[PDB]
Amino acid sequence: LHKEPATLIKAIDGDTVKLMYKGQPMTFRLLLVDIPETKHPKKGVEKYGPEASAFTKKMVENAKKIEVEFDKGQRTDKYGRGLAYIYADGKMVNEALVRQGLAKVAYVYKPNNTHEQHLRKSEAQAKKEKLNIWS
């Protein structure tokens, strides 16, 4: 895989960020993670949703640079959102959320599963530390 540059447009939720990618605006869904959401009439604002959303927001707004990394499979989902690992100054946002207990590792769809073990390791540590969602 490779990283490519992108420019932040807007953080939307814990697991959605709008980016300028190759001169086009696009909505990105973070691969392999489920975050509590702020948006969904079903439940409204889930617990840790505001926290997860603020965490992602701070991390990308304060970055020197943002990079996107597509996986080996489908690069868009059925809603037209890009499917990618997002990096802020070299640090993967998807992993940072899971490491802090602000996200769980999603149901995995091969072949979009390249960083799955790495994330699951971070998830086990957050659970071990009983952080946030695991507290």
Curated annotation (Swiss-Prot):
Chain positions covered by the region annotation Disordered: 115-135
Superkingdom classification of source: Bacteria
Gene: nuc
Location(s) in or outside the cell: Secreted
Record-annotated active site: 29, 37, 81
Location of this fragment in the whole protein: 89 to 223 of 231
Binding site residues for Ca(2+): 15, 34-35
Feature: compositional bias, Basic and acidic residues: 115-131
Descriptive protein name: Nuclease A
Species lineage: Bacteria, Bacillati, Bacillota, Bacilli, Bacillales
Organism: Staphylococcus aureus
